[PDB]
Design an enzyme around this catalytic site. Structure first.
Site, mmCIF file in Angstrom:
data_model
loop_
_atom_site.group_PDB
_atom_site.id
_atom_site.type_symbol
_atom_site.label_atom_id
_atom_site.label_comp_id
_atom_site.label_asym_id
_atom_site.label_seq_id
_atom_site.Cartn_x
_atom_site.Cartn_y
_atom_site.Cartn_z
ATOM 1 N N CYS A 93 0.839 -1.193 0.000
ATOM 2 C CA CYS A 93 0.000 0.000 0.000
ATOM 3 C C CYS A 93 0.872 1.241 0.000
ATOM 4 O O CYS A 93 1.919 1.269 0.643
ATOM 5 C CB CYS A 93 -0.946 0.044 1.202
ATOM 6 S SG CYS A 93 -2.059 -1.374 1.246
ATOM 7 N N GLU B 136 1.078 -3.566 -5.633
ATOM 8 C CA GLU B 136 -0.064 -4.456 -5.469
ATOM 9 C C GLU B 136 -1.352 -3.785 -5.959
ATOM 10 O O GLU B 136 -1.588 -2.597 -5.729
ATOM 11 C CB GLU B 136 -0.171 -4.857 -3.996
ATOM 12 C CG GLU B 136 -1.195 -5.912 -3.685
ATOM 13 C CD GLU B 136 -1.257 -6.240 -2.197
ATOM 14 O OE1 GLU B 136 -0.200 -6.252 -1.516
ATOM 15 O OE2 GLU B 136 -2.377 -6.455 -1.697
#
Ligand SMILES: Cc1cc(OC(C)C)cc(C(=O)NNS(=O)(=O)c2ccccc2)c1F
Ligand code: NA
Ligand SMILES: [Zn+2]
Length: 268
Positions: A140, A174
């Site tokens: 993140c 991601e």
């Protein structure tokens, strides 16, 4: 009732998304956070008392990058669990797709700060899996709202790839990315690939930048700089085309660069 507003440092910030702070913290009109240790508090008076007692003036872990007053700290989720959990709860206020807040041991966290006489002031961070089966060099990535669109996200993106280069590996963030994260990565990929094409296969660009071939390809596709021949993507650009793209408007802000000479980091 959810946390909808925080006080951190000298900033008041409205929330964008639900974050699972405990329910008695959500009921309050405002959540107050120590900008240094990230302890979250219910009341202005508990906040004021903490600020007079708290001795942290920077993130924990080790300072793996320092150039002038720009600093990055690497924080192992297993060695500083509470801190990393508080960071995850803070990030989740501004990330729709983040889902992990309390199981932080598998992660290392890279905290970007801007330093003055008072201390090192948190700007944002990215987390990364210690062991990523999928080859993600970011899990993140979040820049706090008052710092967004000011070069700090570009710095952290560039920084994530500098670590990938040192690991002799490619990586990709991601998925899914936040909307601003998407625009930011596409712009960073364009800049880096266009600059390398000014100064090469897709595989060469990949090894030089640690950007994956898929991210290179989809970036070159958006620039209309790739041909297709018998099942293969092939770069197709003239030096003049590269310069037309490069001096156009969006590549004009002067970046906070990552100076690899100031990066103190050895691959695990
Ligand atoms: C990855 C990322 C995440 C983010 O947080 C969201 C998740 C809440 C914010 C930024 C950000 O602030 N981007 N603007 S930028 O740094 O000026 C920049 C300029 C040119 C190329 C790249 C970036 C960001 F990059
Ligand atoms: Na705000
Ligand atoms: Zn504190």
């Amino acid at each position: 009732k959810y946390v909808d507003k925080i006080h951190i440092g000298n900033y008041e910030i409205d929330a964008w998304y639900f974050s699972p702070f405990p329910e008695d913290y959500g009921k309050q009109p405002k959540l107050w956070l120590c900008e240094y240790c990230l302890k979250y508090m219910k009341y202005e008076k508990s906040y004021r008392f903490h600020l007079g007692q708290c001795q942290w003036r920077q993130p924990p872990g080790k300072e793996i990058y320092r150039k002038s007053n720009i600093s990055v700290h690497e924080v192992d989720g297993k060695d500083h669990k509470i801190y990393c959990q508080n960071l995850c709860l803070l990030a989740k206020l501004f990330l729709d797709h983040k889902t992990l807040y309390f199981d932080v041991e598998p992660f290392v966290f890279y905290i970007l700060t801007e330093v003055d006489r008072q201390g090192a002031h948190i700007v944002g961070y990215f987390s990364k899996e210690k062991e990523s089966p999928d080859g993600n060099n970011v899990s993140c990535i979040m820049i706090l709202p008052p710092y967004q669109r000011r070069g700090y996200g570009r710095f952290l993106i560039a920084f994530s790839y500098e670590l990938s280069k040192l690991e002799s590996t490619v990586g990709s963030p991601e998925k899914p990315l936040s909307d601003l994260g998407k625009l930011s990565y596409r712009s960073y990929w364009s800049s880096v690939l266009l600059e390398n094409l000014r100064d090469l296969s897709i595989k060469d660009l990949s090894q030089m930048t640690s950007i994956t071939q898929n991210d290179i390809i989809s970036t070159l596709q958006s620039l209309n700089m790739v041909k297709y021949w018998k099942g293969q993507h092939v770069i197709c650009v003239t030096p003049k085309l590269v310069e037309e793209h490069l001096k156009s408007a969006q590549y004009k802000k002067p970046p906070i660069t990552v100076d690899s000479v100031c990066l103190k980091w050895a691959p695990p």
